[PDB]
Design a binder for this molecule. Structure first.
Ligand SMILES: CO[C@@H]1[C@@H](OC(N)=O)[C@@H](O)[C@H](Oc2ccc3c(O)c(NC(=O)c4ccc(O)c(CC=C(C)C)c4)c(=O)oc3c2C)OC1(C)C
Length: 168
């Protein structure tokens, strides 16, 4: 992972969302660059499984995040999963789970998906600023290579919003 800036980190989180679209489960991926320079990636896929992983004995989502690159390079990572009518939440800080998986709400059974919100640890990057032009260029190409998915990008730092969808 490149540490010139947090873009590559974001693209890896975006790729996990797009993989759900490519598999035919997600129809939309939303990316939001927050005012505090944190990035949030939301998809309407199946939702990162929250049931126990046999070998490890911990929620699959907890395990995936624990070993993820976002967790390693972010001072904070908050994940919300919509699955089976339930909204599960879990968070890590400085690389450590600071909030066990827990049901924070309910939702429609058909409303599934995952939200990954992370705050890069500025100490690991030459620059903590996200390169917007680079983020949008890669996203657009992503929309192109995954026909049918609607990709939106909301920039709350430069106050702009865009959406792209390539039907075929
Ligand atoms: C970083 O997590 C990624 C996902 O990222 C997002 N945003 O959804 C996505 O890329 C992909 O997500 C998958 C990949 C495979 C299945 C999949 O095979 C499912 N089918 C099941 O019936 C199932 C139900 C519960 C369960 O614990 C598992 C196995 C666990 C896995 C695949 C982590 C499978 C399912 O419900 O959801 C899935 C999901 C959401 O792979 C992950 C979990 C590594």
């Amino acid at each position: 992972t490149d540490t010139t800036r947090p873009n590559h980190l974001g693209q890896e989180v975006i790729d996990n969302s797009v993989d759900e679209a490519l598999a035919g489960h997600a129809k939309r991926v939303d990316v939001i660059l927050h005012a505090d320079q944190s990035l949030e990636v939301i998809d309407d896929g199946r939702g990162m499984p929250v049931d126990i992983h046999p070998e490890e004995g911990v929620p699959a989502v907890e395990l995936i995040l624990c070993i993820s690159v976002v967790n390693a390079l972010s001072k904070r990572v908050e994940v919300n999963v919509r699955r089976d009518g339930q909204v599960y939440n879990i968070a890590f800080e400085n690389g450590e789970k600071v909030q066990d998986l827990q049901v924070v709400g309910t939702c429609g059974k058909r409303n599934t998906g995952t939200s990954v919100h992370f705050w890069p640890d500025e100490t690991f990057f030459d620059s903590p600023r996200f390169s917007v032009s680079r983020l949008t260029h890669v996203l657009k190409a992503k929309a192109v290579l995954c026909p049918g998915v609607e990709i939106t990008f909301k920039d709350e730092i430069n106050n702009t919003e865009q959406r792209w969808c390539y039907q075929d």
